[PDB]
Amino acid sequence: MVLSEGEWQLVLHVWAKVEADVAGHGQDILIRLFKSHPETLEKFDRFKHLKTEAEMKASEDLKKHGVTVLTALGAILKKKGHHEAELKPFAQSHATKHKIPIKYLEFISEAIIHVLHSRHPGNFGADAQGAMNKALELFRKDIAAKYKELGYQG
Numbered sequence: 001m002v003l004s005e006g007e008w009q010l011v012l013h014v015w016a017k018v019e020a021d022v023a024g025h026g027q028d029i030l031i032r033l034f035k036s037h038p039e040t041l042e043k044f045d046r047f048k049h050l051k052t053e054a055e056m057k058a059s060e061d062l063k064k065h066g067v068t069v070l071t072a073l074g075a076i077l078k079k080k081g082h083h084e085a086e087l088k089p090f091a092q093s094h095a096t097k098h099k100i101p102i103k104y105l106e107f108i109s110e111a112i113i114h115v116l117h118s119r120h121p122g123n124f125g126a127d128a129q130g131a132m133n134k135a136l137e138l139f140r141k142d143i144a145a146k147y148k149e150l151g152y153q154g
């Protein structure tokens with residue numbers, strides 16, 4: 001798929017707001033993921049023990065990882081589709097080391113959209129949400145293809 005330039009502008013306009021607080025957004029997104037789809041927490045040996053939202057919110061480690069996650073995602077989105085190099089090491093670790101199926105990448109996509117909708121309603125109307133969904137769909141399609149090349153196809 002190909003996004004148009006106007007679709008990329010909508011994506012990068014709300015992302016610029018996200019970047020004003022990368023740690024806060026990273027926390028909100030991982031907590032939303034783990035609350036909505038508890039099975040995903042099981043993939044993280046470092047966080048598997050956390051029992052409640054309060055414990056998750058209190059975790060310095062979780063917040064640090066949320067920064068790592070959004071920083072990587074931001075690098076990919078800023079490439080506006082030209083992200084082949086960025087995708088390779090992500091794909092290899094998530095396919096071979098962490099063993100993360102495509103369905104769980106759909107779940108985190110849903111988490112990202114929920115948090116942006118809650119925090120940025122004025123910059124995340126219907127058109128902006130459709131553009132972010134398309135950007136994430138593009139991401140997931142390219143990762144599924146790389147998964148297959150790598151021998152996992154998740």
Ligand code: HEM
Nearest residue numbers: 040043044046068069072073090093094098100104105108
């Ligand atoms: C937007 C999607 C995601 C991005 C950008 C992302 C990015 C990253 C990055 C940069 C790392 C550290 C380097 C590495 O090991 O590759 C990482 C580690 C990891 N990721 Fe992801 N991730 C994403 C989605 C997921 C999902 C959905 C899961 C599981 C449900 C997951 C599970 C893990 C695990 C288990 C680790 C290792 C944590 C540790 O023990 O340090 N990732 N991810």
